[model samples]
Target chain A: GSHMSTITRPIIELSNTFDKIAEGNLEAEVPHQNRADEIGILAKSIERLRRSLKVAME
Target chain B: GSHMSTITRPIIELSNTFDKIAEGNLEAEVPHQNRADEIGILAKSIERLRRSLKVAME
Candidate 1:
């Protein structure tokens, strides 16, 4: 995590997390929300999307 | 565009676009989808979220 490219792994992780949510894995925790970067913003958005979908299903 | 940090502006733009979508601006175009990077992944996910909410409301 010290010397790695910042744009590769996090995007992959976020995309996978979103896929799980899209497949009804609403219990999944979206990682990277605490990041103070672009990925963080995306994570927060995904979290909001998860909540929206969960409430929509209710 | 060449000298700026990659993690700042795009995240703000994506967040704002998501806000607009959350407020029922489904017609807003999600920018940065064509970016071949982490932001691109996030943009695609936001686009998916928009579509999901749009279809959910239908």
Candidate 2:
């Protein structure tokens, strides 16, 4: 993680996470919400989506 | 843009918009994230950047 590019993995990981999510894995964490920018915003919103989706089916 | 492509432009637009941000233009927009996938997720999150930067200097 020392040499990771800023904001680069944020978007890429979210997209990748979405794939697993679509495949029905919700317990996995949403990465890259450490900033105050949209990246963080996305992480939070996805958490909401994750929570909502996870709870609704439970 | 109807047939231009999906996810491709999301990454492209974000890269382009990020350039403008580096140049101090915060009002411009992020172009993608209009779906449940990572694409739309990226769009909404970037909008947070637009607002945060816009309010900082105003």
User: For this target, which candidate reaches the highest DockQ against the unseen true structure?
Assistant: 1
* Model 2, C-alpha of B20: deviation from truth (Å): 29
Q: After superposition, how far is residue B46 of candidate 2 from its true place, in Å?
A: 14
**lDDT of candidate 1 over B1-58, digit per residue (tens):** 7438765677678778867875767789989889885567678887886776667568
Question: What lDDT is reached at residue A23 by model 2?
Answer: 53
TM-score of every model versus the real structure = 0.71, 0.46
Candidate 2 wrong stretches, greater than 4 Å = A1-7, B1-58
For all the models shown, what interface RMSD does each have?
2.4, 11.1
lDDT of 2 by residue, B1-58 (tens): 3546653545456667656654558668667545776466756755665565456558
| Candidate 1 Cα errors over 4 Å, as ranges | A1-6, B1-7
